Structure 1
Amino acid sequence: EVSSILEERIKGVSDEANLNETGRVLAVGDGIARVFGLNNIQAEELVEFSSGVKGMALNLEPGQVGIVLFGSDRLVKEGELVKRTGNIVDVPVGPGLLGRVVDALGNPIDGKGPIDAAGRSRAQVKAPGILPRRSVHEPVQTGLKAVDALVPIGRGQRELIIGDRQTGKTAVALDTILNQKRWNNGSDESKKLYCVYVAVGQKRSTVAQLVQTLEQHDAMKYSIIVAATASEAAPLQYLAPFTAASIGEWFRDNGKHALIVYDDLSKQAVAYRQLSLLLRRPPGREAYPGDVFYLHSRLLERAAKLSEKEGSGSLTALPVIETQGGDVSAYIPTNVISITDGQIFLEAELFYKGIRPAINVGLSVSRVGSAAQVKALKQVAGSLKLFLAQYREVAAFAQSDLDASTKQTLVRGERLTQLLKQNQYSPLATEEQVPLIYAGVNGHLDGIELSRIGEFESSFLSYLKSNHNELLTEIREKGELSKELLASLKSATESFVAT
């Protein structure tokens, strides 16, 4: 049916012409084919073998041009015609990748056929200049109260999510995407963040879980999953965030906003290492290449809030770095920490102690500050930062029979600690982040016993909807808590708390 049409389409491809350049493999070993010919080849050009495998041509040497294969050596053998595509590595870019899972090359692995790509743009293109950037002024909400308030995130921004291996590392990230489904629905196209998850060395099963979760929360319809799977070749893995970034530039340049989540650059680092060693390019500190720093900095300079002459748009990024037992002293962590502005340091002890999200906000910081925080949320969360800090410090005064003052702090802290828990894959609207934090800040949850804290939250919210969902809407639209809103809110919180 479709097949009759498809065969007709293929039949309609039959034009052929003299190939400007060709190579014939001289020898192929270790995925480093050394090809004889390709005299006028462009550098890093995409090359197509007789096996049809793709490569790029990192080394142009006078005697031989050492292509690096992006695929298997099994199907590659000596004296193999290597047609010269004459096109430097480029990937399709366009609005077609929205709600589409494609492999790195840009082929749909969801098999949703041809991508609606209005350009193919080269994988690497240099970062926007000093004047092509302007300051952040657009919050982005993850739907996690702690993250939105304690670590306020905006758009343009680059901040790590550096923490222990598969502690639902991906889960923390995925939560943001789900809250972003709400914003995406919104017609303001700066609030249409076309999220990109870049699955780097992640098994197809792991990405399968992600895909189904995305389908379930209907998040497939703006998602792009650039997929460099665990089995997929280390050159594909290496170029995978770079390739992905070019897609991101298309949105950003178009003035749109989007969020790209590189997961995990630690394994990206390993792939580049594998490649570099195979090219016999020397090791460097922590047996990682020395220009790994250079690589990472290039990638991260493509996340930027562009000047308004260059369009309002931005790309926001949140690289995920996997910590080998929390060793941020490691070369790849140290480098990234300096390049990025903010870090989120997920605290594994807390994870083990069943606190999900698991974060220590002693070791999370954001340097994109309150120009990435909602004004309302800022007001009611200076206190929150301070209270939790005290709860931490006065923790050890409980680990002894000691003053009522310490005990007051501890209760206020414990209720807050309990409040910032949230079973993963439940995002939250900011207009409901603010009330919960208001109550806690005012210590009205101190009375509420720990078991009833969980119950209180949802009840308070439903109460707010029944009593005055006008208040919630008003909070949302003003974006600032007016004296009148704090007035009404104080009354309301008391009444709910009383029951």
Structure 2
Amino acid sequence: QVSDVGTVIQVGDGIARAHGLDNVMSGELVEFANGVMGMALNLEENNVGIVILGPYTGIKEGDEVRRTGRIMEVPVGEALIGRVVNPLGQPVDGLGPVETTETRPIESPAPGVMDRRSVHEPLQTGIKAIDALVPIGRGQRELIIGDRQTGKTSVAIDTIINQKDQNMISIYVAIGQKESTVRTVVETLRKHGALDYTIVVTASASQPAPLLFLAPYAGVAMGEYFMYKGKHVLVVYDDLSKQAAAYRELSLLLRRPPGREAYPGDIFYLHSRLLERAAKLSDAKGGGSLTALPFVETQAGDISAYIPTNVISITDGQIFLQSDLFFSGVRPAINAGLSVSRVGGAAQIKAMKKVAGTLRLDLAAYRELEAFAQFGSDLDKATQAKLARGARTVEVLKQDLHQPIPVEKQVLIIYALTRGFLDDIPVEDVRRFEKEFYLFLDQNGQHLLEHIRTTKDLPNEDDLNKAIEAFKKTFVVS
């Protein structure tokens, strides 16, 4: 009997090698004696190479291995919403088991060329410095890239929290994160109520390399279940660099020759296969969509490194966060020089597209003028364009933590800035101006807010100026 039973020959460093299993198939789940699962990676002539998905300390040479008959799979369903699970679907928060009744394979083909539709629906992140000049549409995949301690996790958490009104399911996948950090993130989600529609998949730095390698595929396979039902899903991968490091460790343990920077040859194929499943399905396929926000941690802002360039070569844009800006008070840390959205703009509401279209390039020009003007003095119009506009734009794009702003409240203040109603008040007062203008609008322009909400356009050609001046009358300098 060797068809469905095997025997371990070698154990070490999280990988094993088994004799027998003549009728196993490539990528099949196998179950060891301890209950620890594995995956059949290589089908050699006399043995099978198995990657161990769990604690390998309890596995010894001579232990029995048996088939399961299933290609690598994860449980899916609505019973998974509001739970914290490992990449194998095992519940981790301790709130009892999970009652899912369906499964999907880890590896699945991506939607075809004719299965997709152009992105045309906005994803409102609730952050001005994103929704204004780097818009994100549904079905897009946008890269978030920056150094450590820059707010990458905060951006994703704010985006996830802002989705409460919208009909969207959120999946937060943490790869290599600290368990205390994951616990605190889960607590913020619980406090803000996002656990009504959120699934959290975790694989901490203490877990063996295969689980870190495997987590994003489990997340996207969980997302596809809702995507193919005609729903909208958002998936956040907290690090793809740590997944790449785990895969490099696995490859070197398997003795595959390394390429550039010791990474294996298919380090590009890994990420492309993962990120190509995010798509905007058409009306024939149901109209569902999946949105991806992969993370990449750079070293000293080197955007030209191998992994950052590989990930840039896949996604539909990137949002670059700068540590130099994050320190010294520019807390959202958006860098308009290196941030762009290739698919966005066609998925932006008409009012915001009508108002804040030129802000990205105007702010980049202001940034260049900021270094140029350090050489001395300049023209009166140069000083105007610099100090009146750019400083106020920078000070109004700044935003506090976990404080989303509705898109209408964003477009009002952006219009007020771009039409010159802010040019007079001091730079050190515009944040108070915005904070009180939101309350003033809530009190007196609810019909303008409804106009924007319903028709997705500016409330009127000129009518807003009367209310803006009415607020300016009651507002006080300093």
Alignment TM-score > 0.5, same fold: yes
What code does the residue aligned with 1:63 have? N
Q: Which residue of 2 aligns with 1:319?
A: 294
Hey, which bits of structure 1, 4+ residues long, moved more than 6 A? Answer: none
1:60-79 paired onto structure 2 within 5 Å: 60-79=43-62
How far apart are residue 392 of structure 1 and its match? Answer: 1.2
Cα deviations by residue, 1:146-188 (Å, 9 ceiling, x for unpaired): 20010011100011001112322111111111111232xxxxx
Q: Is 2:163 the counterpart of 1:180?
A: yes
Q: Which residue of 2 aligns with 1:455?
A: 432
What code does the residue aligned with 1:31 have? G
Q: Match for 1:473 among 409, 433, 450?
A: 450
Q: Is 2:419 the counterpart of 1:436?
A: no
Q: Is 2:472 the counterpart of 1:497?
A: yes
What code does the residue aligned with 2:156 have? A
Distance 1:27 1:383, change over 3 A: closer
CA contact (8 A) 1:135 1:305 kept: yes
Q: Is 2:120 the counterpart of 1:143?
A: no
Q: Which residue of 1 aligns with 2:333?
A: 358
How far apart are residue 350 of structure 1 and its match? Answer: 0.3
What code does the residue aligned with 2:119 have? V
Q: Which residue of 1 aligns with 2:136?
A: 153
Q: What CA RMSD, in Å, does the superposition of the two structures yield over aligned residues?
A: 1.5
Q: Is 2:64 the counterpart of 1:81?
A: yes
1:377 and 1:238 map into 2 onto residues whose CA distance is: 40
How far apart are residue 20 of structure 1 and its match? Answer: 6.0
Q: Match for 1:282 among 257, 260, 263?
A: 257
1:34 and 1:310 map into 2 onto residues whose CA distance is: 42
How far apart are residue 54 of structure 1 and its match? Answer: 1.2
1:74 and 1:166 map into 2 onto residues whose CA distance is: 35
2:25 and 2:430 map into 1 onto residues whose CA distance is: 64
How far apart are residue 384 of structure 1 and its match? Answer: 2.2
Q: Which residue of 2 aligns with 1:408?
A: 384
How far apart are residue 19 of structure 1 and its match? Answer: 10
1:157 and 1:332 map into 2 onto residues whose CA distance is: 20
CA contact (8 A) 1:95 1:116 kept: no
Structure-2-length-normalised TM-score: 0.96
Q: Which residue of 2 aligns with 1:90?
A: 73
2:293 and 2:15 map into 1 onto residues whose CA distance is: 34
Q: Which residue of 2 aligns with 1:15?
A: none
How far apart are residue 28 of structure 1 and its match? Answer: 1.6
1:82-121 paired onto structure 2 within 5 Å: 82-121=65-104
How far apart are residue 77 of structure 1 and its match? Answer: 0.6
What code does the residue aligned with 1:406 have? A
Moved more, 204-213 or 66-75: 66-75
Q: Which residue of 2 aligns with 1:417?
A: 394
CA contact (8 A) 1:380 1:441 kept: yes
Aligned residues: 472
What code does the residue aligned with 1:84 have? R
How far apart are residue 472 of structure 1 and its match? Answer: 0.9
CA contact (8 A) 2:127 2:404 kept: yes
CA contact (8 A) 1:141 1:179 kept: yes
**Could you list the runs of 5+ residues in structure 1 that have no partner in the other structure?**
1-17, 184-191
How far apart are residue 305 of structure 1 and its match? Answer: 0.2
CA contact (8 A) 1:383 1:441 kept: no
CA contact (8 A) 1:200 1:230 kept: yes
**Could you list the runs of 5+ residues in structure 2 that have no partner in the other structure?**
none
Cα deviations by residue, 1:29-69 (Å, 9 ceiling, x for unpaired): 33322111111112111111112111101111121111111
CA contact (8 A) 2:14 2:208 kept: no
> Secondary structure of the equivalent of 1:398?
helix
2:162 and 2:76 map into 1 onto residues whose CA distance is: 25
Q: Which residue of 2 aligns with 1:13?
A: none
1:298 and 1:423 map into 2 onto residues whose CA distance is: 36
Cα deviations by residue, 1:415-467 (Å, 9 ceiling, x for unpaired): 01000000121111001010010111012112111222111112111111111
> Secondary structure of the equivalent of 1:426?
coil
2:371 and 2:469 map into 1 onto residues whose CA distance is: 32
CA contact (8 A) 1:390 1:409 kept: no
Q: Is 2:345 the counterpart of 1:370?
A: yes
2:332 and 2:421 map into 1 onto residues whose CA distance is: 23
What code does the residue aligned with 1:23 have? G
Q: Which residue of 2 aligns with 1:3?
A: none
CA contact (8 A) 1:356 1:424 kept: no
What code does the residue aligned with 1:147 have? I
Distance 1:397 1:331, change over 3 A: closer
Q: Is 2:31 the counterpart of 1:54?
A: no
Moved more, 19-28 or 215-224: 19-28
2:95 and 2:229 map into 1 onto residues whose CA distance is: 24
Structure-1-length-normalised TM-score: 0.92
Q: Is 2:236 the counterpart of 1:270?
A: no
How far apart are residue 114 of structure 1 and its match? Answer: 3.0
Q: Is 2:272 the counterpart of 1:297?
A: yes
What code does the residue aligned with 2:443 have? S
Q: Is 2:208 the counterpart of 1:225?
A: no
2:303 and 2:417 map into 1 onto residues whose CA distance is: 33
